[PDB]
Symmetry: C3
Subunit: 461 residues, 3 copies
């Protein structure tokens, strides 16, 4: 008989699986909402700098109305290489935060010390890519190890996951401390790490530490040491499938599973995956209204406490967003609180600025009175941001990039406890100035020019 070659079949379930991590794909858990699960592991948070400035530049006339297609191409080219090195070293890319991403190495408690050596060596090879030579892009890496807690929340047709814990805080703080082209270990990490191998220098006014270089023992063989660590890695491609990047590529049609997975991904993306829409139309530089919500609590690391609150918060957010036409792009822990990245005009309608401000007030009013929510903080920005699918062929997500996305993210941090909006949203909308308040100009990190920032006061006095 003939033994014909079996072509890699590109099933919808395999296409959908590219938008999610192995954490979710092979994570079988109760459909009850919320849901929590606890485990240990190492977290890597890679952040690329200079792309929002590049995104701003690509809207200019010189790219001849191909700025969105020029941006995805160069953006994905560099991120694909990063994603490969994460996947090849046994990592799981959890989430794509615009030009930044969050990776995870999930392991049992005792095997952290060994994994951090793998994650550190991985992070150095990632940094090694962009020391060579896409002329002004830098990269920041923060590493943290310890207890992590997944939270899965949502309704019957949608689902959203996010990670919680001291490690999730540590990794972000570590990355904020990071200078241009540096690797920062949290205080719990480095303590967990094998201290004989890793050389470091102390950060000023900080208990975290910077990695200079690995100084491995004499007869050390990283190829052998890696193979030991792969024993504890669950879904690392092996045997016949060792040539693959992800085990998710080998998935087979399973209606039950696909129904579960499709809830996490947007309808626009599913239409494209189902071949009922062209691939290029999701990549675009369009005028949107960013609405960056941020919910803070008394104890941010307590999964059983904040889990129910975020579920209650989501159910209201998604409902009021649906009335005005908004959509939740991403949900993730952003500096001591869960943050919903909402977008209007993704759903293009006039009076979008008038809707966005009213919904921010609507969300603020409900979220303030939900139990255990200590502080609600919302930021609103409007302008030309990039929208599109960012990542590798086997691991990518739909995300938004731009200076207005940065702006809205800072506004909720720098102006907490209140709803805030930029100059474009203020003037574009036309409620009287009694509806707003002019705020003092604060100098903000990671943003060029705020202009006059305002606080949406409300309809009544």
């Amino acid at each position: 008989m003939n033994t014909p070659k079996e072509e890699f079949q590109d099933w919808p379930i395999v296409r959908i699986a590219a938008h999610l991590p192995d954490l979710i794909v092979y994570g079988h858990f109760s459909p009850e909402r919320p849901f929590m699960d606890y485990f240990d592991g190492v977290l890597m948070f890679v952040d690329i700098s200079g792309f929002t400035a590049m995104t701003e530049k690509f809207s200019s006339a010189m790219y001849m109305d191909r700025g969105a297609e020029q941006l995805v191409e160069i953006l994905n080219y560099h991120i694909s290489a990063i994603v490969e090195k994460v996947l090849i070293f046994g990592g799981d890319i959890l989430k794509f935060a615009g030009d930044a991403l969050l990776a995870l190495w999930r392991v049992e408690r005792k095997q952290l010390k060994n994994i951090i050596t793998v994650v550190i060596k991985c992070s150095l090879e990632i940094h090694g890519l962009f020391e060579t030579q896409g002329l002004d892009i830098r990269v920041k890496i923060g590493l943290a190890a310890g207890h992590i807690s997944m939270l899965v929340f949502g309704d019957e047709t949608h689902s959203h996951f996010l990670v919680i814990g001291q490690a999730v805080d540590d990794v972000r703080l570590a990355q904020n401390m990071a200078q241009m082209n540096d690797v920062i270990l949290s205080p719990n990490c480095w303590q967990l790490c094998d201290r004989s191998m890793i050389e470091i220098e102390s950060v000023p006014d900080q208990r975290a530490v910077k990695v200079n270089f690995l100084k491995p023992p004499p007869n050390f063989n990283f190829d052998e040491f890696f193979t030991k660590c792969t024993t504890f890695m669950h879904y690392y491609p092996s045997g016949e499938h060792k040539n693959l990047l992800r085990l998710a590529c080998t998935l087979k049609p399973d209606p039950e599973l696909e129904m579960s997975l499709q809830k996490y991904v947007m309808e626009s993306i599913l239409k494209q995956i189902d071949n009922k829409q062209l691939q290029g139309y999701l990549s675009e530089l369009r005028p949107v209204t960013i609405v960056f919500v941020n919910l803070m609590f008394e104890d941010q690391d307590k999964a059983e406490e904040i889990g129910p609150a975020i579920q209650d918060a989501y159910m209201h957010i998604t409902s009021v967003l649906k009335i005005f036409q908004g959509q939740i792009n991403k949900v993730f822990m952003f500096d001591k609180g869960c943050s919903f990245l909402c977008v209007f005009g993704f759903e293009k309608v006039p009076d979008e600025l008038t809707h966005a401000l009213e919904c921010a007030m609507d969300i603020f009013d409900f979220c303030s009175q939900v139990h255990k929510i200590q502080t609600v903080s919302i930021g609103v920005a409007s302008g030309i941001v990039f929208c599109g699918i960012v990542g590798h062929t086997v691991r990518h997500e739909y995300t938004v990039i731009g200076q207005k996305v940065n702006l809205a993210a800072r506004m909720m941090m720098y102006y907490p406890g209140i709803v805030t909006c930029d100059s474009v949203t203020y003037n574009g909308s036309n409620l009287p100035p009694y509806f707003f308040k002019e705020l003092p100009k604060k100098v903000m990190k990671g943003v060029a020019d705020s202009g006059p920032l305002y606080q949406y006061w409300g309809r009544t006095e």
Copy 2:
């Protein structure tokens, strides 16, 4: 010099060839209509059960308006494996009858006895796939060997082929006798088969027999025995091309040939093949009106007798269908008669129920008075049926699946000599009840609930 790798070129003629068997692709014959050709061979009729119930289930709310895409995926996943095993064992998939399919091993008279061993071993490996574990699907296989007669009919822009003979009757009867997960040999088969190898048990009130297992001679080598049989197989991939499933994959641009082949395939499919339409839009769960015609004769096996009649019948069918907006999905011998599967709203228009009943009457009136047509039987059903491309990448066809397709197929059998319509067609249309007659409720095989079935009586009394 450099010797670069030659990428498999996906020409339109190769794409079109996937919708047809090798019987038609490499069958060069006169363009006169009708056309008959006579030969010997073994027929396998594989039928999957439980998918119309699954199709009904996939229209529910839990699949979140991705039931059509969920269905094709799981359906094709299982059928692809079946198609592979047919193609790898040297078979030719003639036709896809919804979730069922018809295969053919064409050989000279004396080599039947050897081929049936190959077809039986093939059928056992096909049954072997679904004994393991898509939780409630069963499969039925019927096998028949003997004289077969092809009939090619149609007009100048369209063509339709179908097989005729005692073997074509035997194989269907064999499959109807088959219990869940069984292999049934016709009485002519088993007599043709090597009786020393095959063990069987007798079917009650039947001259056909069930296959239990192969009991091959002591020093038998199926790999060697297969290679002998491949000598008599014309188009079995070999040499440089042995890695391919079909020889049709190696086809090269030939306007003459492509003009001949494109007539067999629908315009909707050609538009998709020509890349003037997205792939996903043909896969859909849509409300249609099935019109299942069935023409019976005095001698069903006589190709020279019924061939001209079916040609005359087609020419009227296609003309009156074009007036109302119908389309012939499939034509094939279904239990002692040639049966046209027609579909309305494939061509979406209001008053589609009013058109379907009038055309059934129109077809009935003409077909009754065409010479040699003993009995005309038409069944009409309306509801949500699945439409889409079913099969393997190299061998697939556009077909329809659903409980309403089953219903219309039974109605013409159980209520012969008259036009019949279901409750949905009766009430949806609004001719007075004088135009219809209420029929007695018969218990029908392969259908859940008929409801009140009616007979379309006519305009006049």
Copy 3:
């Protein structure tokens, strides 16, 4: 660690690079317009005959409205084989002139003699393809070696390149002399070629010569001799990439470069490359209005003289074309002059014939008064011509084919110094006959039936 296979990534810059030669892709030069660059090399001009007759045939009823898709398929099938043999022998396909194409082997002065042996052996293998057996197609090859001069001209959003020199004239004249299935060397070639190897017969009333066959020295090894010549070839795939046809396939995202390259390609093609348009819709048999401009000079080979003139000519052409809706398909040296192939209704509008004639007059009036332009000659033809992407997957261009394209090309040659239009353009438009003049019927090469040809006289007397 795992070392996964790296799938050929199909970046937009790689897709765009297929529409251009290595001359342009790896040619880094000043953005000033015009730009000239001088070098030596061998030119091959392959021309296929009988396809415009085939194109005319494919518009008939027998192809069932798939003539455009049938034509591209068979056309590209034969041209792909030609393109491969050019690329494999180290050539660079400069331009696709409908069913004809222009190749280039760029080398230093002293290595011509060796390259011509490679080009001749290449041309014989190209001719060898179509001596076997797409029933009435012939091929003509002309070869010329010597000094070549590139000219790059255009505006800020578009660019156009073309080659100038005695070699560029020689190669066209050589091809015009060529009988059906012949290889013609120019007088400078053959003198450059190794005369011991190549056997020839003299052409009547001509200093050019026909190639009969190569008669290589005793212990000659073409595989070894080729490898010597590849030392002087810049971009010939080698090492890890020797399995590729073009080095351009290995291109990596470079915004600067991609901005430069995208100007050469049409917006319609970029939309398709960006996946915002289906591939099939550019392939079509549509009614157009061809406007074939031809600018002649005192010294056609002088790059510094005619370069500025063509730049000045282009800037007016593109502007007046944009008013009426025209588009420049191709620009190239056609028999002693630079020729712009313009097309209307590519931009479908009524009164397209009324626009085309006025623009021809507009272009004629300006171009006549531009310095150094000795003779302006314009031809206008209207009818069903083929439009689509012609070539290989790695090297293809958007071009137009048809008898009306031939007609407009002859009209400007046979009726120089004036604007001319065919019978279809005359009668379809409705300016009074005072606006036109009836011309005498000249017998023209490469066209079937002119009908009454007219001269667009003008609005005033």
